[PDB]
Design a binder for this molecule. Structure first.
Ligand SMILES: O=c1[nH]c(=O)c2nn[nH]c2[nH]1
Ligand SMILES: O=c1[nH]c(=O)c2nn[nH]c2[nH]1
Ligand SMILES: O=c1[nH]c(=O)c2nn[nH]c2[nH]1
Ligand SMILES: O=c1[nH]c(=O)c2nn[nH]c2[nH]1
Ligand code: NA
Ligand code: NA
Ligand code: NA
Ligand code: NA
Ligand SMILES: [Xe]
Ligand SMILES: [Xe]
Ligand SMILES: [Xe]
Ligand SMILES: [Xe]
Lengths: 295, 295, 295, 295
């Protein structure tokens, strides 16, 4: 037997960092969960009980805190690239670092119409994420994402003209509820190393903001022929607005809300044009995925 | 042996309702999870296998949808009271109904600075809840609550002057992070029945809004001596602003963020006045509760 | 305004303890999550920012570890009573301690038909729990419970003869699936203090084992007329077997498995006597509760 | 822009099936959660709103129930292969089906030392899983797995001789607790189609049982030099016992249990050889992965 692939490291490392502006007194908080996995010439720790090649996962944890102390933690694309590069430069036998970061929302509170200097609220479990793969001699690959964005529209969604056969019971519809949790990922062109990532720093926050805005606007405005059709329009627009993105991937549950026929009770009318009360279904759900790239 | 207490019913009934304004074209959605448990002369279903006294839980589920179809579902205090009253009036042998409702946020989207007519976003897992107990001949008791409101302040929290003995290791502090998930409940004076609840309908949304506003403002502005002291100030203010509330209860986790001493690494300074990077602790957590009423 | 009720303390304190038999080499592990909340003359910490009355929650955490170090942690009823008594005896102004303990399963592994001296498996998320309330001058009240025991029987469950009216669609049945998650609690007669609890130590594990055995046997053997009827038979038997229990409470979800009519597809027969494939429903669920005590 | 990749289908489809032996009266239940995603010539549903190419996800759901009705659901490797093959043979324009199945434990109850004919218990959240990819003209690729197997050993685990540098604080140890949740996957050699899968049917359950047994025995018996070293020994043995497996992958969290120094309190000794009470850490955790294949 042989080791075909191996990676190890520390997961679920929670980090908080505060920045204090001494002039204005304003404070800003960042909170993240970080995972770092390493690869390299480490096979002998598996096959010969040779621990000499192991950077302890506890040390990886220490390194994350030290790196956060000495560097900016925003945008997460930059922080992940700094953290990944550290491991491949510091340790000769480590040739790849894989860094995943989940950023948690701490939104500044407005108290009496003005921004508070040091109080924050978690407005929603929506996350901003990055995956950074730093590979010795192959540069830095970054995938940025948003997830956990839950939306619903109560009309302007249709679904008709699908294949009908002996397995089909679904009725065609020209008016339904559409609800989903959005997971969108944009993959950056490969960067040669940290200098190049630093040169593009302003594009990271701007493109996150654009991806979010395009997603919400298109969802709200499209008279949707299907989830497939609406999600394609989203990805098309993101690719048009940022030339440094190579692909956009969407993964969307279709969370079903079923009509409830109440006619058995005093002829009560609650279907089709008369539908007012629906039953949200926890499961099953549709799952629709697409990866869109350039011609 | 004897049946000392018994209640039964249907839990986790998910309901969505849409209102359509034909004039303006604006749609508004409500989504709730409802639990209804009944009590009454039902002991024989337990002791003698006498099912004749059982309103089937499936029928309770049907009743929730029918009631939602025929009545407004907002404010939840009114809807719960209508639903509870139904069971005690309809069934002679049912003498109490206990209705719990969790309201889920669907917030209207703003697209290009204007409110969208039919698209919504789940901005946070904060809930608005009600517990309604309708008891034959004893009226309607309502407890309203908000929960899942997660906040953090990065300074202006202190904790010193506590008891010190041989079990104590905690250092006194004049500057710490304070973070909590707020659970606040206000209990209404007993109402004689549905007519009285209907007469107070405007107070329900207004008092929810006041409770939320007082919580956020007090948390942001108090130079907090302890969670105990800050939470008392919140409850005091709610009671002052709404005379129909008898008690206010707060239950608050103290979610700890620990300093990380990095001095072992190149004399790096990250504690006390130099603290920038902290480790959020998933567990254990403080849990502080208070019920405040009138003199 | 006045403080009507107040309690505070530390929640989610995870504890592991190992016992090592030096003779045999056998090791035994216990793992628990503990919550301790205190009450007493602590109102001024809320109303006057007087921290002098506060035993810090961090100190409560320390006390839990110290107490576990110096005392047996099994049965949990004894450990909770020791922990609760500590606080009311140590601190003059603390008059009640409320201790909740959740015991996690670590079951000794059998390797090649023999018990391993130091390796364990988590066989199921079933918990054994205790709630201990120690109140100065009113003794020790203990409620013991099991929870998270998930069972299913595929036949020998019926449900017919229930109330039928204009809200009813449920068909009567003489053969259905019955599945539930069992939560059972037995409440002990009040104990005068720690000496009396110690005198009954052997009854705690024996009664837990009896409650579990009665639950499983009755569920498997009863040709169930309803959840109500079957749960009553369980509680009756527990009360008969242990005279020091005052009440038994069961809380049982009825987790529904629905027939699927497949007749629309090539006349496929899958209902009534022909039912083979069912759809488990995540929600809603029935919820049935009973508290049984002595004549 | 172009569609680079696309797949869609139905997730979280819960299925239960009962088998009834008319002779013996014994019943056996199977419960699964199934996900089916399809790929093929479906790009136009995304790019041109052409729904004619879409097999509705609701129809996929119907197909899962119909297939379960007409075929055995065990072993899951066979059922997944039947389900996947159905879609690629039935629909000319569908060229790949991806089927994931999670099998839930329903273990027959023993009542008074004998197996009950129709009552079952969920003994643990351990799952048996399969991933089946059926690709037109490239056969059937099956990965089988177990997950959610949580174990702990209280001694006979060491970790010393790792890299030490300026980022390292971890002390070497010759005696620690080792606890993990096991995720193990074995990948079968490619099968040409359904006939070949059927020919190997007995190997599926046998190899699952072997993988489980090897995992538990090796964990319990290895005087572990590291998680890396112990997991390699597991994979080596599985590959030796089943020649039709090409690779074995393990993914293991290292769930930390920390010593608690209590010496500050009356010189209490609770570290090193005196350690009895530990604090389980919810996060962070080590994460160690390996894929082992044949020379
Ligand atoms: O938007 C949809 N896309 C689909 O593929 C589908 N299948 N059923 N309903 C559906 N809705
Ligand atoms: O605000 C606080 N209240 C308390 O009771 C406490 N105990 N430790 N830290 C604390 N902080
Ligand atoms: O056992 C049952 N008890 C009930 O109260 C009920 N209601 N619907 N189905 C039911 N089954
Ligand atoms: O078994 C271990 N492997 C590791 O890589 C490691 N790092 N810290 N502790 C550890 N334990
Ligand atoms: Na390197
Ligand atoms: Na009545
Ligand atoms: Na006392
Ligand atoms: Na095909
Ligand atoms: Xe969408
Ligand atoms: Xe607070
Ligand atoms: Xe039951
Ligand atoms: Xe391991």
């Amino acid at each position: 037997s042989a080791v075909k692939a191996a990676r190890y490291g520390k997961d679920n490392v929670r980090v908080y960092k505060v920045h204090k502006d001494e002039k204005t007194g304003v404070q800003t908080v960042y909170e993240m969960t970080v995972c770092v996995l390493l690869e390299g010439e480490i096979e002998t720790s598996y096959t010969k009980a040779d621990n000499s090649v192991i950077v302890a996962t506890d040390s990886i944890k220490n390194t994350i805190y030290i790196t956060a102390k000495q560097n900016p933690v925003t945008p997460p694309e930059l922080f992940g690239s700094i953290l990944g590069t550290h491991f491949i430069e510091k340790y000769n036998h480590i040739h790849a670092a894989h860094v995943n970061i989940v950023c948690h929302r701490w939104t500044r509170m407005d108290i009496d119409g003005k921004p508070h200097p040091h109080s924050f609220i978690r407005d929603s479990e929506e996350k901003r994420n990055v995956q950074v793969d730093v590979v010795e001699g192959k540069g830095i690959d970054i995938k940025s994402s948003l997830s956990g964005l839950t939306v619903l529209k109560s009309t302007n969604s249709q679904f008709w003209g699908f294949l009908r056969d002996e397995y089909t019971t679904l009725k065609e519809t020209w008016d339904r509820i559409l609800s989903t949790d959005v997971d969108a990922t944009w993959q950056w062109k490969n960067f040669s190393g940290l200098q190049e990532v630093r040169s593009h720093v302003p594009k990271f926050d701007a493109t996150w903001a654009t991806a979010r805005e395009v997603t919400l606007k298109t969802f709200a405005e499209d008279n949707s022929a299907s989830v497939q059709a609406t999600m394609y329009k989203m990805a098309e627009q993101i690719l048009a607005r940022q030339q440094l993105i190579e692909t956009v991937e969407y993964s969307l549950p279709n969370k079903h809300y079923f009509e409830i026929d109440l006619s058995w009770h005093k002829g009560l009318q609650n279907t089709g044009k008369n539908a007012e009360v629906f039953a949200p279904q926890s499961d099953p759900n549709g799952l629709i995925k697409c990866t869109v790239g350039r011609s």
